[PDB]
Structure 1
Amino acid sequence: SRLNRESVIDAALELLNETGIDGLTTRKLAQKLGIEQPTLYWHVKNKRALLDALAVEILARHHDYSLPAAGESWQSFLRNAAMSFRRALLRYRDGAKVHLGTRPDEKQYDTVETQLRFMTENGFSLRDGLYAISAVSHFTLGAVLEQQEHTAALTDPDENLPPLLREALQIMDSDDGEQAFLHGLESLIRGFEVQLTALLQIV
């Protein structure tokens, strides 16, 4: 079939959903695309190159709230961006692992620059603006990775559970992690706000 970048990425993302990240291989991709492995090699040098491209393309295709809307508050921007990032990571099987194992594009660098510009224009020091954006990223990625790895582990004993843990596990299994995530996200943002507004005051 067609082996332009877009078609190779489409096929690989579809394969990822079938195999997961550990099972994804260039050999299986060649099969999916109806080609011999040396043919694929011309287009895609190895699994690492493949994964780097997928990670970028997942965000490029699906992380559609990467920039603030005109006039949007920083609080709202971080909230929306976090929700968008989470959605994008959850869209594919092992998506967060795919994302984790890369380092950003030149395009992603521009976006981060704009986000950093935006934060600093809203009163954050560069340091605090960065730490905020980092913390949102770390929390969001951590939440998705726990969810997705937990799912992955299931494919491979209530009577002894103590009562609060039993109830906590019931609570956590009750959705895909969204409720816990959204609650933590508000706490994170409010913490940032308390810090920003303090300026040089002891807080």
Structure 2
Amino acid sequence: SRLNRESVIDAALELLNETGIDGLTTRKLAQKLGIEQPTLYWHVKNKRALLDALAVEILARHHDYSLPAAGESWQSFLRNNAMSFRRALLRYRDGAKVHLGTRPDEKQYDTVETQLRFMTENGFSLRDGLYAISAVSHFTLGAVLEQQEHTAALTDRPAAPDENLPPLLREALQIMDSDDGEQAFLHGLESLIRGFEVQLTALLQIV
């Protein structure tokens, strides 16, 4: 089929979503595209470069809340941004995984520069604003990956017996099995944001 960049990335994203990073091989990508491997190689040579492109594409498609509304508080922006980031990463198998360790792409520079400047306009130093952004990002990535991977491993095996569990752990596992992860995510997100705030508002005060 067609092998422009958009279509190669579209096929790789479809494949990722089917069988994850491990199934994103030259043979399988070549097969989905109905081409031979040396044909594929002309268009994409390097798995990390493909993964990097997929990480960028996932957010282009489904990360809706990348910039603050006019007059929006930093707290509200980080909340809305985090929910959006989470939703985008949950949209594909291994979506969070593809993101890990990437750095912003040139297609994202204007957006992420605006995010950083926005933080600094709300009183953060660049460094403290980056710490807040990194913490929200890391929290969100971790939450998504644990959610995704746990669900994936139900398929590779049953959990365990209910029998030998101690009681608080038994209830905690019930609490966790009763939701997809969003409730715990939202709770932790607020705790994170409030701690950033206490830190920002302290200035040079002991806090």
Cα offset for 1:66? 1.1
Does the 8 Å contact 1:51/1:98 carry over to 2?
Answer: yes
* Cα offset, 1:107, TM superposition: 2.7
Offset at residue 23 of structure 1 (A)? 1.7
Q: CA deviation at 1:198?
A: 1.1
Given the alignment of the two structures, is residue 123 of structure 1 paired with residue 127 of structure 2, yes or no? no
Task: Tell me how many residue pairs correspond in the alignment.
Answer: 203
- Displacement of 1:101 after TM fit? 4.6
Cα pair 2:75 2:193 within 8 Å, conserved: yes
Structure 2 Cα separation of the partners of residues 126 and 198 of structure 1: 17
Give the whole-Å Cα distance in 1 for the aligned partners of 2:48 and 2:131.
Answer: 29
CA–CA distance in 2 between the matches of 1:125 and 1:101? 24
Within 1, Cα distance between the matches of 2:191 and 2:101? 28
Contact 2:143/2:181, CA 8 A, preserved across alignment: yes
**TM-score w.r.t. length of structure 1:** 0.96
The CA distance in 2 between the partners of 1:195 and 1:82, in whole Å, is 19
- Residues 86 and 144 of structure 1 are in contact (CA less than 8 Å); yes or no, is this contact kept in structure 2? yes
1:32-181 map, 5 Å: 32-156=32-156, 157-181=161-185
Give the superposition deviation at 1:165.
0.6
Greater CA drift, 160-169 or 106-115 = 106-115
C-alpha contact 2:63 2:87 (8 A) present in aligned 1: yes
Q: Aligned partners of 1:152 and 1:109: how far apart in 2?
A: 34
Q: How far did 1:195 drift?
A: 1.1
CA-to-aligned-CA distance 1:111-136 (integer Å, 9 cap, x gap): 22211100110111112111111110
Q: Is the 8 A contact 2:124 2:200 kept in 1?
A: yes
Give the RMSD, CA atoms, in angstroms: 1.2
After superposition, give the CA deviation of every residue in 1:45-88 in whole Å (9 maximum; x if it has no partner).
13222211111111121112111111110000000000011011
2:6 alignment partner in structure 1: 6
Q: SS where residue 96 of structure 1 aligns?
A: helix
CA distance in 2, matches of 1:16, 1:127: 35
Distance in structure 1 (CA, Å) of the matches to 2:107 and 2:12? 21
The alpha carbon displacement at 1:180 in A equals 0.1
Q: Distance in 1 between matches of 2:170 and 2:194?
A: 30
CA drift of 1:150 comes to 1.5
Question: Which 5+ residue runs of structure 1 have no aligned equivalent?
Answer: none
Identity of aligned residues (%): 100
Structure 2, unaligned runs of 5 or more: none
1:26, 1:46 within 8 Å by CA — same for their partners in 2? no
The 3-state SS of whatever aligns with 1:179 is helix
Taking structure 2 as the reference length, what is the TM-score of the superposition?
0.94
Do the aligned residues in 1 keep the contact of 2:15 with 2:23 (CA within 8 Å)?
no
**Alignment check: 8 A CA contact 1:51 1:102 kept:** no
Distance 1:41 1:191 in 2: 48
Q: Report the Cα offset of residue 199 of structure 1.
A: 1.1
Offset at residue 102 of structure 1 (A): 2.9
Counterpart CA distance in 2 for 1:25 and 1:46 is: 11
Residue by residue over 1:118-165, the C-alpha shift from the partner in whole angstroms, topping out at 9 and shown as x without a partner, is: 011011111211111111011101111111122222222111111111
Q: Please give the secondary structure, in 2, of the residue aligned with 1:160.
A: coil
